[PDB]
From a paper:
Latrophilins, receptors for spider venom α-latrotoxin, are adhesion type G-protein-coupled receptors with emerging functions in synapse development. All LPHNs have a large ectodomain of approximately 1,000 amino acids, with an N-terminal lectin domain, followed by an olfactomedin-like (Olf) domain, a serine/threonine-rich region, HormR domain, and a GPCR-autoproteolysis inducing (GAIN) domain containing a GPCR proteolysis site (GPS). The N-terminal region binds the endogenous cell adhesion molecule FLRT, a major regulator of cortical and synapse development. Here we present the crystal structure of an N-terminal fragment of murine LPHN3 comprising the lectin and Olf domains (hereafter LPHN3Lec-Olf).
Numbering used by the authors:
A (entry chain A), B (entry chain A), C (entry chain A), D (entry chain A): 97 to 137, 143 to 393, 405 to 459
The structure:
Amino acid sequence: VVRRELSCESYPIELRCPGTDVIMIESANYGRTDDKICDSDNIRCYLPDAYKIMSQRCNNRTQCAVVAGPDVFPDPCPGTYKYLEVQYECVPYKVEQKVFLCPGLLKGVYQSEHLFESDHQSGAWCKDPLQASDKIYYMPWTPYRTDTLTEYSSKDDFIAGRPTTTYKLPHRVDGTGFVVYDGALFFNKERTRNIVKFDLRTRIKSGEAIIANANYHDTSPYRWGGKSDIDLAVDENGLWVIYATEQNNGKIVISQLNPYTLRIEGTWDTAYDKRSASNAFMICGILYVVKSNKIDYIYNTDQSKDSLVDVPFPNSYQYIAAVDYNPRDNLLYVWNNYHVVKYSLDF
Amino acid sequence: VVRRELSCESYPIELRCPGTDVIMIESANYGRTDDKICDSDNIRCYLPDAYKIMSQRCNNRTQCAVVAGPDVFPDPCPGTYKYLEVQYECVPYKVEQKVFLCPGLLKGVYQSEHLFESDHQSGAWCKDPLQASDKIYYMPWTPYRTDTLTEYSSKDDFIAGRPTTTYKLPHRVDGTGFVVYDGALFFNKERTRNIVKFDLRTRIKSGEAIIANANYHDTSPYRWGGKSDIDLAVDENGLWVIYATEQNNGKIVISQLNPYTLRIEGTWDTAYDKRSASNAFMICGILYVVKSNKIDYIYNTDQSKDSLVDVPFPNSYQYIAAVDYNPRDNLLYVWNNYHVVKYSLDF
Amino acid sequence: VVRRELSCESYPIELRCPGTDVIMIESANYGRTDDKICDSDNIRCYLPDAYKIMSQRCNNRTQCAVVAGPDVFPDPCPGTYKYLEVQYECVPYKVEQKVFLCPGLLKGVYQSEHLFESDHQSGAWCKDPLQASDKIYYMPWTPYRTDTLTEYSSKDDFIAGRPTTTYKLPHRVDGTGFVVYDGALFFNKERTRNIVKFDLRTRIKSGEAIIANANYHDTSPYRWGGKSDIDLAVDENGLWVIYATEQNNGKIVISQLNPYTLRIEGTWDTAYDKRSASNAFMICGILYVVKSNKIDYIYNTDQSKDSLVDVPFPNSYQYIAAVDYNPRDNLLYVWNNYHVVKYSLDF
Amino acid sequence: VVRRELSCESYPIELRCPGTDVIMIESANYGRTDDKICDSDNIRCYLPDAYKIMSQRCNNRTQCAVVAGPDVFPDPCPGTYKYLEVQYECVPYKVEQKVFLCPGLLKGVYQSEHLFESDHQSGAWCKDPLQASDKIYYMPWTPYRTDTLTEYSSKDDFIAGRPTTTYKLPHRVDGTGFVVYDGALFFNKERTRNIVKFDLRTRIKSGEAIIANANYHDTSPYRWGGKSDIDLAVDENGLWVIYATEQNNGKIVISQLNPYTLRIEGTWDTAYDKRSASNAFMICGILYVVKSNKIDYIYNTDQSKDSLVDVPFPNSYQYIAAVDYNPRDNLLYVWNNYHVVKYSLDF
Ligand SMILES: *[C@@H]1O[C@H](CO)[C@@H](O)[C@H](O)[C@H]1NC(C)=O
Ligand SMILES: *[C@@H]1O[C@H](CO)[C@@H](O)[C@H](O)[C@H]1NC(C)=O
Ligand SMILES: *[C@@H]1O[C@H](CO)[C@@H](O)[C@H](O)[C@H]1NC(C)=O
Ligand SMILES: *[C@@H]1O[C@H](CO)[C@@H](O)[C@H](O)[C@H]1NC(C)=O
Ligand SMILES: [Ca+2]
Ligand SMILES: [Ca+2]
Ligand SMILES: [Ca+2]
Ligand SMILES: [Ca+2]
Ligand code: NA
Ligand code: NA
Ligand code: NA
Ligand code: NA
């Protein structure tokens, strides 16, 4: 929706966008286009650079204050009493285009970072790839008692055990399949085949989606168990759901979930038994299944074709609780038998 | 609607309200009430003064930033890792209670201030009594060509002819009957018996009300004419409409208009011919009619009783274009034959 | 905000307002004003009655469907392919003007209706005077356990004990001082000097107001006690708060509360000790205090003048728990020692 | 956001969603879970099928009315006075999953339907693939005078020249590159490198996106010219922008545009000169370039790989003004030298 501001010469113009939304200049003029605006003692006074000046000073910002005068703008009509007229919009914060571009085909998964050894055998952690932020999101695994999400301002604060805040979730969580995308938490509602969307900035449930025919609550989890039936994943294409159905004889089923409309945007049936998989993740719309040790299966959703592979994966620890791909830094956010680690990817 | 913020010890809590809305602390606790919030190495840790500290620091403000720690709060439980949990609302800016309290019964109208002599014989001007501001709103009278409202930051800037901004109205204006109340402009839409509500902060029409059976467009104006058929008025009770109907044989009819719901909240029929009145205004729900020179008639809406009076009014100039009462400063904002003046009131 | 609809000849126009909001036609034309609208094989084709037809068919309705054709509209230009263009707004439902007009000065309170004898000694009940509805709202009094409001579709259903719905309140209630106004419940939040606004249609808290310096939780209740410290009241002027302050030595203090902005719009200090009052209510901005038996004191907020009176009140029962005035039907909604009654008023 | 309804036995529950949004049942119970709800003369009374009954009766509907009683629900506790308690959300209308699934690789483009021969040599037309509707959207090409979009209820009404409505656009349109997606019109704003989003249901601009470095206004159009610089396209992946940049030496550049966030989600540089292309379109994230006669070039965005091809295209007419792919019916919506046609696709 179009927002409007106008200030007479020597007065500032004030632009402000709600929450995390940012300014986008639609139009701007410094001069005079009307004989009634800004009462004083030439209605064809235009400054073509007014649009450029306002865009440079205000675009990508939550707020802007610009004085309508000679300190900021050249004079398009000396002698004429001028005014600054601006039309603008509040748009979601911009995202670096690399987040949506495929880095290539996965050659292997390798050790990279070892953050710390937690006192919890299972759990999950990630970053929001749509944000240029150092924020880490952490959800520990406690059977039948998980309903919180802890936020850390950096990796350094995360290792030191220094949280910024904690979120009380509207429902209990089943498994370690959680993801954070564009300021929203996505999780599997305990004892349901539903995904809950929880807005972190306003601390309220912003929606719910039913994952049609998805098996739930220790019916089709990963090898380790722990109610891992439904796993969410983020990649270059958006948000995904990794689960299994009786219709597909307990084999992995993958669906694209629109994070804004909560619609299921395409479903693909794989040939890999979910109970046999230690974990799984998406990269460029391709499902990578972990066996434990190695990636032994891939499913390409773009071609609707699968293949048997022998892609390396770290053999260090046994209890693989969570594996989350990040399309911003191209790293795997892993929870493996108490150890909180980051794995590099070779393309 | 309830808004929530939470920050772990040493981190700041950030409260922000949209537009001109202000913070109201609902609840606050600095301590520990839950064993899962703010992950670290006593769930009955309360600070009773947390509510008082937050209220003092954040109430009546657009924004607030408070660090959850020993610089701002005492320690309710030394050794326990604490967090600040706050529940708050965004409410319209508070108004000094005097604005709604009757100063008394009017003894007379007297000269007080003479701002300047305009080049326009007719027009109208006022301040928003619900705002603690020096802002002046000005609408000149130009037959069939009025569609702007000019704003000045102070009396000083108004006399000097230094405007802050100008508003382009969605429709043309009939007469000098305009008023500003709680950030909204109220005016009579040209060639209609309708009142338009225009939000000044967002620069959009926020509503419309039809003044049932009101005479319009030089049918029942004030003595001077100029399409003065419908006059808006602000007092201790709110917003009023001063007009005339054929049902009341062209005599003044007064209605209370709710500025928030746009409903007509009571209508009273007077015995004064509107065409004979130079102008009129409300004080404490009492209509005061000007003849030119003197106030010769009053109508009390609380009692539904009228009386003939001889209340003094300045005899200086003839062409009385506008008379607007202000319940904050208890002054009359008058436009009389080019002269822009303020009249004092003796109670 | 302006809403727009347009349909080519023979097609229907569909107008819809959210919730309880109603249509108000701003403008309408059946004909042709543009050479590009409604593509077919005269751009000055107007029907003046189009505005009248649309207003008659759509005003005061939640929804409207009108066919753009000869069954509903005359032909302003035969041969020319026409279209119906409408501009409209969604406004709060209209209210009969009598609700805001003073019936007169109270001569006495008299018995009228005896609905039923409840099993609860104390409680409160009312109707929403801003709605043309038979709905009754009921709140029983249970010490430290009150957090529900029950709704009945009629008097008949209320006596029979046939509820339509129950509302779970966000907080516990202190006393029997509750009121319903313009679809919103107003109550005193347990162990606070705060008034909570709860929207009944959406079932959420819509705001909160602090009653500055108000005594609360068995400090200054009515004679019967039961945490009656703060009593809400509805009359021709709007919403009121009846309470007491230490600043006024425990004597009744009355404040106008804006139900839309949650602002305190004027405060008046009375000379009647609240602990000595059995109950109190407002009519035309005048406070009427009950002693038990009789009305022995009045306070006129319009004049800021009080008087000692001897106004009759029914002597039938002793334990007067609640007295709520209704400005639509001009009756008192009373709860007296198990008996749920309506009292008439002589003006 | 969660919406709540509750009705006591024999009373109906009413669920309504705004605009085109549909109901999604979150939770439902017919019975008794609380001793205070629905006042009458067992707080563990549950009906497991209540969720199933409500979902079946209300899911995918704008509105729902269900009576809380024995005509619709079995009795989970005879003798106990029951109530129906429902929690629900309003979600965007569901979309058939085929719209997001790739039909295969394009073997050729073939003649299928010939609707009519227009009096306009150039123009554009389409359907909204996210809607299960017969609605056709039409924009004729008139140099420097295009600012309207006409809607037809069916193919039959479109051929007959019987429109339902016309939309007045906030800005003039450059070229025939328009698209309709999820109730929103997307077009290139005249003399700019910007895409405007216009909501058809509310008739207002809902956003704007700048296509960084895009050539505009007869700099890089298709062979026929007519300000075709920027072309929008819809496929299984969403919304795309087909344009050219000086950085890519006037060769086709393709970008994914998020229709909800207005963000550019990935950009790919092709090797095909845009001025040499008659038109272009996307299918499964693959760009197909038309030469006139044949498809002689493809660019796969999933692989970031291009190939020279010889894919058939109808040789019937010369002046190819628009080619729009539809992912619901897998047809090309084409405007070729006055003729309005549909082309089939062989996979
Ligand atoms: C700021 O806004 C401009 C305007 O479109 C956009 O092009 C740019 O990508 C955004 N991000 C940055 C870092 O400038
Ligand atoms: C700030 O907020 C408090 C909280 O109710 C209110 O009492 C006060 O009147 C308002 N205004 C000022 C100037 O403090
Ligand atoms: C319907 O709308 C009209 C338009 O202003 C209004 O005058 C009238 O009072 C309202 N109420 C009824 C019952 O018509
Ligand atoms: C109705 O709602 C259900 C609930 O998720 C959904 O599964 C289904 O796909 C939607 N569409 C139809 C045609 O039922
Ligand atoms: Ca995973
Ligand atoms: Ca006046
Ligand atoms: Ca009372
Ligand atoms: Ca195309
Ligand atoms: Na996951
Ligand atoms: Na006025
Ligand atoms: Na009350
Ligand atoms: Na297009």
